[PDB]
């Protein structure tokens, strides 16, 4: 084999195997070649920001990662040197992880990769029944089901999610089964073994949890059974928990509004408490208000430890949790200003307010339609209003530097003042003769009608034109991404549950088969879905 | 969204004031209102201390509301 | 016909600068009139911000598209 | 904007090729590492015995088909 | 801008021995499904006068393809 790192490890089986030359390889193993032996060079690793093809290091892997069926089945059960199946690599892969690894969802990629996947569970099955091939976990404690999850390759978790395997021996390997058929209507069943709940790598939890980067976590939840156990879980479960989270917060910010609302206007903070029963009930809301900002602010806390966010995806995924978060920063600082004497606590007490009464909409998610709306509301600001308010600000900026040169000794004659004054045109308030303060009035007008026609007509329009353009493409992606946003606030309720609940575990336990490999029976929490269809009697 | 997005800057800036002529949730809900059809004062008041958390509070409400949401409703309009 | 249908950017990048000219040659020939120049290159200057631009894709599409509304819909709705 | 977002597209990558050409153009400095893809043999067969160093440049590609 | 031969000169690939030098776009080695392709980039990227970056760039605004060339797989990945 070859001992420089680049190359390490390829030997003359590795170099066969590439080539598609089944002589050679069989020539090969005939003659005593390793069928074990590990391409760990570094040309044979993932390394984004350099050239190679990692397929999992071992001929088996590079047979199965290469579409060749016939290498696979000689390899496994050849008379010389049989592969092992269950091998892994450096990783900690085995030929499944590697053919989720090689995944990318294009159509001819996913045929194969879920035909030898398939292929190699059926011989896996029958040349050790008692072998468990997609229970293995890689280095990251990923299981090929996990390790797809996670890595977006939604074709491959299709596949699995819904496989149905038809001939005995190989029945126990399959995850939907059909219980009943009648006329056209027939009750089919989907394991869920590993999906809704087990040791580390639930599938719902994989996908809800990603880290923002994978290609189609918004997409992952329409594969069949995880829609509709989400719709379960909701309906039957979270539904309830979550209209009375909002029910609470509606209540909070209630007293939060009635306790700022009358407070004290004299000077000079704290105020003393005054014996009578408005005082009471405001100091009272005071305490609650403070007590829920705290709340939130450990919240915000718990979040950031538990998801430990990388400083970027801290920022362009999870904003409810920042809104949430800032909310309560002010509402702390507006205590230690209140305590320190300063009446500038109420400075910060309003913008709390204000993004309290703004994340109201944070539970918009729970209405389909309102929730859609909201995702919608969220790239609104995020493309269309952000990139219109660098041109118009730039706009703004450079006419209202031109007008304040040329006013002298005016009553504006300050970048904040005509900043302010051009500004009133947009929201159609706009003087037109705020000020007669200059010399050359033909400059003067020729700049106020170039600046309204520019932002007032020009922009604006485009504006609208522009999130036109945007609702239409948004359409899917939006209700993908309110799916996704229910999703987590299922699984966070699910998590919390502050009662040891155990109904929230739901689908039921049915025997699938019953029969093994080996003598005993098999019950596998199914989830039962209904079907009907008027061809293919 | 509109109501839930007027109720919560009425509140704030109405809290904001003191003693004035304004400070009450209905006559600063109203004002605030005036900005939807065009009208809004942007200095109506000047009952509070701290000029700029006042205007930057109405400077937000007018983004968000007459800029994003309005424009957002014909967009939307038009899609339907 | 070249030199207005394509490559505007250079020319307001060059209007910029002469009216830039014209202030200093205002300013030096004793008449107040320079004022009105510079500030027609100061708010132009700002303008030409947009320029830079380019470069990024999606504020990039937005100058090209207020470029595109500029030379039509905005002249025959001004007409 | 529903008729020109391709043309849009199109165009932007157009005058950031622009901006790369000028930039390359005035270069201020003397820097002649502008010129980049290195200079590669690609057949070592000229129509005489002689081998063709042509300043290539690298592409990968991965294809799931055509084995 | 005549993108079509365009698009067939830049990556032009002649199977067949003495008439390899021909080609512009040499594969220098495979894999299985992975594969690293050169292209030539001679009058391309620079050469005396007419570098096919500087004569699409600057044409005259009345090539009928001009915003299209840039397509072609060399040039977008060289630009970039
Ligand atoms: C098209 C010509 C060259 C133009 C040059 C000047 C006079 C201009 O008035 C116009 C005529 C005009 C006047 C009033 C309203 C609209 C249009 O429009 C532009 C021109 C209109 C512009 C439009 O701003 C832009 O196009 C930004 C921009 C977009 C794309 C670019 O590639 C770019 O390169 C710098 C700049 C801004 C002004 O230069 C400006 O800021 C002033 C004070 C008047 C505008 O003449
Ligand atoms: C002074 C007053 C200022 C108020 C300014 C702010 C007004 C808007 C307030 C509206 C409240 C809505 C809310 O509470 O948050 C909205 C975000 O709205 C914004 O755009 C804030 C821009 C800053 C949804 O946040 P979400 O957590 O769902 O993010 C999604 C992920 O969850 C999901 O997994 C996906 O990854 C998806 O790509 C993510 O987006
Ligand atoms: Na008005």
Redesign the interface.
């Known amino acids: 084999s070859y001992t420089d790192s680049y190359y390490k490890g390829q030997t003359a089986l590795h170099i066969a195997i ?1 080539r ?1 030359n089944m002589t050679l390889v069989t020539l090969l193993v005939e003659n005593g070649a390793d069928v074990q032996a590990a391409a760990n060079g570094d040309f044979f690793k993932k390394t984004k920001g350099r ?3 990692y ?1 999992g290091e071992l001929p088996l892997s590079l047979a199965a ?3 060749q069926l016939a290498i696979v089945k000689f390899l496994l059960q050849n008379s010389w040197q049989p592969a092992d199946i269950s091998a892994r690599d450096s990783v900690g892969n085995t030929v499944l992880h590697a053919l989720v690894e090689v995944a ?1 969802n ?1 159509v ?2 996913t045929k ?1 990769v879920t035909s030898m996947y398939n292929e190699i569970l059926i011989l896996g099955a029958k040349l050790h029944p008692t072998l468990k091939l997609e229970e293995i976990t890689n280095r990251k404690g990923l299981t090929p089901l996990a390790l797809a999850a996670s890595s977006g390759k939604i074709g491959v978790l299709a596949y699995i999610l819904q496989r149905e395997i038809h001939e005995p021996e190989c029945r126990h390997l399959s995850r939907k089964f059909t219980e009943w058929a009648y006329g056209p209507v027939h009750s089919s069943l989907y394991d869920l073994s590993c999906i809704d709940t087990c040791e580390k790598n639930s599938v719902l939890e994989v996908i809800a949890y990603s880290s923002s980067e994978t290609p189609n976590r918004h997409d992952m939840l329409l594969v069949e059974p995880l829609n509709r156990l989400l719709q379960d879980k909701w309906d039957r479960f979270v539904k309830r928990i979550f209209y009375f989270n909002f029910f609470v917060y509606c209540l909070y910010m209630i007293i939060f ?1 009635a306790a ?2 009358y ?1 004290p ?1 004299e000077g000079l903070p704290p105020y003393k408490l005054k014996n009578t029963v408005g005082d009471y009930f405001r100091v009272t809301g005071e305490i609650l208000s403070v007590s829920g900002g705290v709340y939130f602010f450990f919240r915000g806390i718990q979040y950031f430890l538990q998801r430990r966010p990388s400083l970027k995806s801290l920022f362009v995924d999870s904003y409810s949790e920042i809104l949430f978060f800032v909310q309560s920063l002010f509402m702390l600082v507006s205590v230690v200003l209140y305590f320190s004497q300063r ?2 606590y ?2 910060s ?3 709390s ?2 993004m ?3 994340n ?2 944070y539970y ?1 998610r729970g209405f389909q339609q ?1 929730g859609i ?2 995702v ?2 969220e790239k ?2 995020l ?1 269309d ?1 952000c ?5 118009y600000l ?2 703004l ?3 209202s ?3 304040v ?2 006013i002298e000794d005016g009553k504006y004659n300050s970048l904040y003042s005509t900043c ?1 004054e051009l ?2 045109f ?4 706009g003087d037109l003769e705020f000020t007669e303060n200059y ?2 009035k033909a ?1 003067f007008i020729i ?1 106020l009608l ?1 600046y309204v ?2 932002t007032y ?4 329009n ?11 493409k948004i359409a899917q992606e939006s209700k993908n991404i309110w799916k996704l946003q229910r999703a987590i606030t299922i699984l966070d309720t699910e998590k919390s549950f502050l009662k040891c609940m155990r109904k929230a575990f739901r689908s039921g336990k049915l025997l699938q088969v019953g029969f093994t490999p080996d003598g005993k029976d098999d019950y596998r929490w199914c989830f039962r879905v209904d079907e009907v269809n008027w061809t293919t009697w």
Do not use: H, Q, S
């Open positions: 590439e598609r050239p190679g093809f397929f990662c290469t579409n990318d294009t001819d990629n194969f509004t700022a609302y407070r206007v009446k500038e109420v400075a007490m309003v913008f307010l204000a309290g009464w703004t109201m909409l918009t309102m709306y909201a919608m509301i609104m600001i493309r209003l990139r219109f308010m660098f041109v730039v706009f900026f450079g006419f530097t031109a007008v040169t040329l302010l500004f009133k947009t929201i159609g308030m010399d050359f400059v700049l170039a026609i520019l007509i020009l922009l604006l485009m504006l609208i034109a522009l999130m036109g353009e945007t609702v239409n």
